[PDB]
Design a protein around this ligand. Structure first.
Ligand code: PNM
Length: 255
């Protein structure tokens, strides 16, 4: 068999049409970055950096969205049962050093909460889910934490497709599971919009080398799904990805 199979698995192949967003380049100074927007009503993609929008990268903590949905679907989590007790292990982030529910664990990106979830899910069940939802390369061979700078990788465009599929009820997850998960990542809720999203950060060679912020803005007549990805030697993290996203979104007058 050919190595090329593996190279081709590292990229999402689509020839979807898109509006070019090359004027967004200044926002990504210092990074190889990408921004993907999908306008639900107009059924239209807009993209800055198409090549980077199709490169698959470890999802890191953005994977927690689907890990939670999987857990609801397996009845590991339920609508009134999202609490996990802290094992008394001291982490460098104090918010991690306490009992959690779905809301706090997503807000504070509490790794151990989601590791526990993955621990209780059958590896072959997870593989089945990743096949169903078409999660990037679907590669969980890597470690035990296959979603953290490991085997599993996904592109910005796919990140956007998955959020859209989730919201348009194209996934087989219960609507109330989706509502719980959306609430856990709801950043802002006003009369005129709901703003939802999740950061991710990956460390490679002791540096912040992989940053994500993915989510959507739901208005009174439309939904705008987005993914921002940053690749850099250092300073490529979720917070910077979110900052950039919010500048772009404000500029587009969505938030
Ligand atoms: C809050 C985090 C920095 S930790 C968590 C997870 C997921 O990506 N990332 C990591 O475990 C890698 C990491 C650990 C410590 C500092 C930076 C990245 N999520 C990060 C985020 O939301 O940006």
């Amino acid at each position: 068999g050919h190595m090329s199979a593996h190279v081709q698995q590292d990229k999402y192949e689509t020839n979807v049409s898109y509006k070019k967003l090359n004027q967004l380049a200044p926002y990504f100074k210092g990074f190889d970055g990408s921004f993907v927007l999908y306008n639900e009503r107009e059924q239209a993609y807009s993209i800055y950096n198409e090549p980077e929008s199709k490169q698959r990268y470890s999802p890191n903590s953005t994977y927690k969205i689907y890990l939670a949905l999987m857990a609801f679907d397996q009845n590991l989590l339920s609508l009134n049962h999202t609490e996990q007790q802290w094992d008394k292990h001291q982490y460098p982030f104090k918010e991690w050093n306490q009992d959690q529910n779905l809301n706090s664990s997503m807000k504070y990106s509490v790794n151990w909460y989601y590791e526990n979830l993955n621990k209780h899910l059958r590896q072959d069940e997870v593989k089945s889910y990743l096949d169903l939802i078409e999660y990037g390369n679907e590669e969980i061979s890597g470690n035990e934490n296959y979603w953290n700078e490991s085997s599993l990788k996904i592109s910005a465009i796919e990140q956007v497709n998955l959020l859209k599929n989730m919201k348009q009820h194209n996934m087989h997850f219960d609507n109330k599971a989706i509502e719980k998960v959306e609430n856990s990542m709801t950043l802002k809720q006003k009369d005129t919009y709901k703003y939802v999203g999740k950061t991710g950060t990956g460390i490679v060679n002791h540096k912040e080398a992989n940053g994500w912020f993915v989510g959507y803005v739901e208005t009174k007549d439309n939904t705008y799904y987005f993914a921002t990805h940053l690749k850099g030697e250092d300073n490529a993290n979720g917070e910077k990805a979110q900052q950039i996203s919010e500048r772009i979104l404000k500029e587009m007058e969505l938030i």
